[PDB]
Design an enzyme around this catalytic site. Structure first.
Site, PDB file in Angstrom:
ATOM      1  N   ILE A  21       6.918   9.257  -2.488  1.00  0.00           N
ATOM      2  CA  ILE A  21       7.445   8.494  -1.350  1.00  0.00           C
ATOM      3  C   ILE A  21       6.887   7.064  -1.334  1.00  0.00           C
ATOM      4  O   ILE A  21       7.641   6.096  -1.324  1.00  0.00           O
ATOM      5  CB  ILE A  21       7.167   9.206  -0.010  1.00  0.00           C
ATOM      6  CG1 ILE A  21       8.047  10.433   0.166  1.00  0.00           C
ATOM      7  CG2 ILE A  21       7.447   8.222   1.157  1.00  0.00           C
ATOM      8  CD1 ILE A  21       7.622  11.277   1.356  1.00  0.00           C
ATOM      9  N   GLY A  22       5.568   6.926  -1.339  1.00  0.00           N
ATOM     10  CA  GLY A  22       4.954   5.604  -1.292  1.00  0.00           C
ATOM     11  C   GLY A  22       3.448   5.734  -1.352  1.00  0.00           C
ATOM     12  O   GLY A  22       2.914   6.835  -1.481  1.00  0.00           O
ATOM     13  N   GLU A  23       2.746   4.602  -1.259  1.00  0.00           N
ATOM     14  CA  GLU A  23       1.292   4.674  -1.330  1.00  0.00           C
ATOM     15  C   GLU A  23       0.659   3.536  -0.544  1.00  0.00           C
ATOM     16  O   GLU A  23       1.331   2.599  -0.110  1.00  0.00           O
ATOM     17  CB  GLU A  23       0.795   4.676  -2.784  1.00  0.00           C
ATOM     18  CG  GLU A  23       1.414   3.625  -3.688  1.00  0.00           C
ATOM     19  CD  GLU A  23       1.187   3.927  -5.164  1.00  0.00           C
ATOM     20  OE1 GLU A  23       0.047   4.272  -5.535  1.00  0.00           O
ATOM     21  OE2 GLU A  23       2.153   3.836  -5.950  1.00  0.00           O
ATOM     22  N   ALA A  25      -3.676   1.622  -0.038  1.00  0.00           N
ATOM     23  CA  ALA A  25      -4.803   1.145  -0.835  1.00  0.00           C
ATOM     24  C   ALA A  25      -5.599   2.289  -1.457  1.00  0.00           C
ATOM     25  O   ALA A  25      -6.232   2.100  -2.504  1.00  0.00           O
ATOM     26  CB  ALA A  25      -5.717   0.266   0.022  1.00  0.00           C
ATOM     27  N   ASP A 139      -3.339   0.182  16.184  1.00  0.00           N
ATOM     28  CA  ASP A 139      -2.645  -0.369  15.023  1.00  0.00           C
ATOM     29  C   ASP A 139      -1.157  -0.036  15.072  1.00  0.00           C
ATOM     30  O   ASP A 139      -0.549   0.303  14.049  1.00  0.00           O
ATOM     31  CB  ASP A 139      -3.265   0.120  13.714  1.00  0.00           C
ATOM     32  CG  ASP A 139      -2.879  -0.751  12.528  1.00  0.00           C
ATOM     33  OD1 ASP A 139      -2.595  -1.953  12.730  1.00  0.00           O
ATOM     34  OD2 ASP A 139      -2.824  -0.225  11.399  1.00  0.00           O
TER      35      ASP A 139
END
Ligand code: AN2
Ligand code: DC6
Length: 333
Positions: A21-23, A25, A139
Site C-alpha cells: 500500500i505505502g510506507e 520513514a 497531528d
C-alpha cells in the site's frame, strides 16, 4: 516468511496475500487476508527500537487505539511480534482495511458542499470522543483521515497524541510559538475544512517562519488581546517586530463557499486558542444542522491516562513497555 518489495513481512500463516500500500520513514503498510476471520485487513510493519522517539510513537499509538472504541476512529485488531524481547525487532499492527484517505481523495476530486459537510461532521464526531477522553490527537491532517468502502471516515495515527494538561501546514500557531489544549486540534480541523473548500492547503509554509507568515497574511496581525495571551515573551516580542498585515475576509479567499461553512471556518481558525470554538460547539454549528445528533455522538467512559511519562525514558525501557503491551495478542497472556 512472506516478503513484499524485498522487505520481510512475517505475519503468516494467519495473514496471507499481501499487497503493498505505502510506507513511511520506518514503516511499510500492506493489505492482507485474515484467513481466520475471513476478512481483509491492513498491516503496518513498524521497526522503531533504534530510536527513542519512534518507540514513543509506537507505544502511544498502541495504548490509545486499544482503549478507544468509536465508529470514527481506527481500531487495532491484532498485533504480531516475536515471542521474546531479544528477538523482537519489528511490530506488525493489524487494522481494518480502508479504501483511501482524504489526502488522496483531494488530489483527484473536488468535493461538493454536501461531501464537505458529511466529512466534517464525522471528523468532529470522532474528535468529540477523543477530547471526551481528555486526549489531544496533535497531528490531524488529511492523510490521517481514512475512508472505507462505504465512505465512513476514521481518524488514525495517534503516535503524537497526548493527555491534555512531518508537515507543519496543519499546526496551530501557538505550537510554533511555544500549555497546549484541545484547541490545537480544532485549528487543524479548520485547516482541513479550508482545504476541502478549495482543494488547496490554506497555510502551506515552506518552513517554520514562512508558516507563521502565511497564517498572519490571512488572519492579519494579531490584536492586542491576542498578543496578551502569548505566554512566551520572546515569541511575543518577535511577533511585535513583524510588519503590520490586514485580515483577508474569508469570502475573498472562498467566494463561492457556503456562508455557514465560512462562519464555522472563522471560529476554528482564530489566532487566540481561548476564543477558538470547541468541538461540542462546532458540532452544534448551523453548518452541521442536518447531521448534529448528540444522542448518536458517544463519549469516552473516563479520561485516558498513560499512568506514566514516556518522553525521557530510554528506548530500551520503552521496548520493554511495548513488549508488555503486546503480550495480550500472544498465546500465554
Ligand atoms: N488501516 C488502513 N487501511 C488502508 N490503508 C492504510 C491504513 N493505515 C494506513 N494506510 C495507508 O498506508 C500508507 C502509510 O500509512 P502510515 O503508516 O500512517 O504513514 P504516514 N508517514 O503517513 O503516517 C498510507 O497510504 C495510508 O493511507
Ligand atoms: C464517499 C466518496 C468516496 O470516495 O467513497 C469511496 C469511493 C468508497 C472511498 C467520496 O469521494 C466523497 C463522497 C462520499 C462521502 C459519498 O458517500 O459519495 C460517493
Amino acid at each position: 516468511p512472506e516478503m513484499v518489495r524485498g522487505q520481510v513481512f512475517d505475519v503468516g500463516p494467519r495473514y496471507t496475500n499481501l499487497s503493498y500500500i505505502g510506507e513511511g520513514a520506518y514503516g511499510m503498510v500492506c493489505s492482507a487476508y485474515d484467513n481466520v476471520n475471513k476478512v481483509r485487513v491492513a498491516i503496518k510493519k513498524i521497526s522503531p527500537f533504534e530510536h527513542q522517539t519512534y518507540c514513543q510513537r509506537t507505544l502511544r499509538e498502541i495504548k490509545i487505539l486499544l482503549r478507544f472504541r468509536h465508529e470514527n476512529i481506527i481500531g487495532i485488531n491484532d498485533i504480531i511480534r516475536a515471542p521474546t524481547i531479544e528477538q523482537m525487532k519489528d511490530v506488525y499492527i493489524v487494522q481494518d482495511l480502508m479504501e483511501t484517505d482524504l489526502y488522496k481523495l483531494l488530489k483527484t476530486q473536488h468535493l461538493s458542499n454536501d461531501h464537505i459537510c458529511y466529512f466534517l461532521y464525522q471528523i468532529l464526531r470522532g474528535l468529540k470522543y477523543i477530547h471526551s477522553a481528555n486526549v489531544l490527537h496533535r497531528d490531524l491532517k488529511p492523510s490521517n483521515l481514512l475512508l472505507n468502502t462505504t465512505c465512513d471516515l476514521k481518524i488514525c495515527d495517534f503516535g503524537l497524541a497526548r493527555v491534555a494538561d512531518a508537515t507543519r501546514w496543519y499546526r496551530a500557531p501557538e505550537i510554533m510559538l511555544n500549555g497546549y489544549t484541545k484547541s490545537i486540534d480544532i485549528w487543524s480541523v479548520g485547516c482541513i475544512l479550508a482545504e476541502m473548500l478549495s482543494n488547496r492547503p490554506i497555510f502551506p509554509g515552506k518552513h517554520y517562519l514562512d508558516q507563521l507568515n502565511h497564517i498572519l497574511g490571512i488572519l492579519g496581525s494579531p490584536s492586542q488581546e491576542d498578543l496578551n495571551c502569548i505566554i512566551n515573551l520572546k515569541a511575543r516580542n518577535y511577533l511585535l517586530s513583524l510588519p503590520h498585515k490586514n485580515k483577508v475576509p474569508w469570502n475573498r479567499l472562498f467566494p463561492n463557499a457556503d456562508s455557514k461553512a465560512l462562519d464555522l471556518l472563522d471560529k476554528m481558525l482564530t489566532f487566540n486558542p481561548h476564543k477558538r470554538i470547541e468541538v461540542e460547539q462546532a458540532l452544534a454549528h448551523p453548518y452541521l444542522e442536518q447531521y448534529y445528533d448528540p444522542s448518536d455522538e458517544p463519549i469516552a467512559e473516563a479520561p485516558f491516562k498513560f499512568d506514566m511519562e514516556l518522553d525521557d525514558l530510554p528506548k530500551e525501557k520503552l521496548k520493554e513497555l511495548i513488549f508488555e503491551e503486546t503480550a495480550r495478542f500472544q498465546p500465554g497472556y
